Amino acid sequence: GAVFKLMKSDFYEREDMITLKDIFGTETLKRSILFSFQYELDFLLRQFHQNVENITIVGQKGTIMPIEARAMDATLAVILKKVKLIEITMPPFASHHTKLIINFYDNGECKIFLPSNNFTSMETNLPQQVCWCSPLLKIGKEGLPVPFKRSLIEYLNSYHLKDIDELITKSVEEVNFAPLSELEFVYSTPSKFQSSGLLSFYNKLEKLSDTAKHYLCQTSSIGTSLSRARDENLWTHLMIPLFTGIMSPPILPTNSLINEYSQRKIKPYIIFPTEQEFVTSPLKWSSSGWFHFQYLQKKSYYEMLRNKFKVFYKQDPAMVTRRRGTTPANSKFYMHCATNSQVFKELEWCLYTSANLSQTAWGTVSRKPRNYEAGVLYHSRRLRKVTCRTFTRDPTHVAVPFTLPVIPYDLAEDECFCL
Known part of the structure; x- marks a missing residue:
């Protein structure tokens, strides 16, 4: 079923709970679609396994910190090549505040998370954070429309961006959302x-x-x-x-x-x-x-x-x-x-x-x-x-x-x- 977990912190848990590593670190991860209010790329990108094919990142212009050359290494250089950036320009005093992860696995399995933290190190570790985890979903035809799916699609459409329509919304469409019917x-x-x-x-x-x-x-x-x-x-x-x-x-x-x-x-x-x-x-x-x-x-x-x-x-x-x-x-x-x-x-x-x-x-x-x-x-x-x-x-x-x-x-x- 769906499950709520408390995020582990480097400070509070020294030696159930979740980390970004359990979300992104799994060898069967093919693709992540990320939504957040801030991204520290060298912290986020270190969370992923070398098997990932695509990381699609939707964020507000100015909130995606690039990695400086002095922080680069061999590992990050490879993963960085798999990032596609979709930058939203917002009016003043408005925020891309959503935090959401949509993972796609090798089997065609899909999983969705709502973490409460932005993708930065300090935020992940200092205040307490939680993460809602969806049940496992499968790529497959669906019958009855699932309200969660339908509202998720309205939400994506409401950005009115070509890149969201093609790169995200169409992949979400293929997912059967029956386990989330409640x-x-x-x-x-x-x-x-x-x-x-x-x-x-x-x-x-x-x-x-x-x-x-x-x-x-x-x-x-x-x-x-x-x-x-x-x-x-x-x-x-x-x-x-x-x-x-x-x-x-x-x-x-x-x-x-x-x-x-x-x-x-x-x-x-x-x-x-x-x-x-x-x-x-x-x-x-x-x-x-x-x-x-x-x-x-x-x-x-x-x-x-x-x-x-x-x-x-x-x-x-x-x-x-x-x-x-x-x-x-x-x-x-x-x-x-x-x-x-x-x-x-x-x-x-x-x-x-x-x-x-x-x-x-x-x-x-x-x-x-x-x-x-x-x-x-x-x-x-x-x-x-x-x-x-x-x-x-x-x-x-x-x-x-x-x-x-x-x-x-x-x-x-x-x-x-x-x-």
Whole structure:
């Protein structure tokens, strides 16, 4: 089946888990198609076996670091010749944020990964990272259309590039996606012709169709207010109101929402590292550069989230491993759990994605995303409940690198880490 793994780090695992070497190092690998936000080529290319025939790399212009002559050697020179580069030029303040790997093997087998790390050394090793691994797929004719496959193809088409159409999309077409018939592929694209992001994910949740209602986000970037005049958070003021039916598409005052949350027993959660969690990380502030929440200029927005919604959660310090401590994770997850401690072990749905909690990644009801983003959605009604566990205790549908349970910020002491 599909499986979530925790990425091994050179620092945290000194002498299940995955590495880039287990993904790219296998002698039966014929071809990889890579999508990422940054590529350190001498680090990535060292991961591959000498048997590989083609490496196709889709990335944003300026984010593909060439190897300097002084770093070249005999091995890399050979592998470098097998790289085909597809460079996307993006508008300002937009990102090719998707991370995706499509491998093709000798037998005609295909495997897909969503890693949470970009292909650089520091990113692979410092913050915690995960990797979603698809089941094994086979080149073969297919019968029934598989939603995951179909949304993957829309996503590729939305780049509108000849090289993607010919070099990637046609090879993906040949793959039978039946082993993935339960899952959905959810994405953002800046393409104006293809809907995507929040609006599309909302419609898809509506279509897939008393209790306490838990909506948890784990994200390495928290965007600023949706409006300049008022304090409006994407999770608490737009996403959660939409998913619960508090608002329909044709934004409420804060006080109305707080009351609606009491009354409907909606419990919002954002997992984001405190200031103090770096103290108890084994590389201390080494992983902190990846955690973006810039709230000092608009302090009331933060206060609102921290004190009125009480939205912030942190790791359970008593459950983390010694070797990883409270090192925060650069994965992104969005999940919903209905109850009526054990919260989040059985889910209504869970999205694992490259998308951060920002308007540029998601869009809004009326704005389109600016980024490319991709992820995989597990929905109860598509399977009977989605099962989830924490890697800190290490067979469930999902595994997450934060503790379960997560613990509310202590309002007397904890502050979101502010870079």
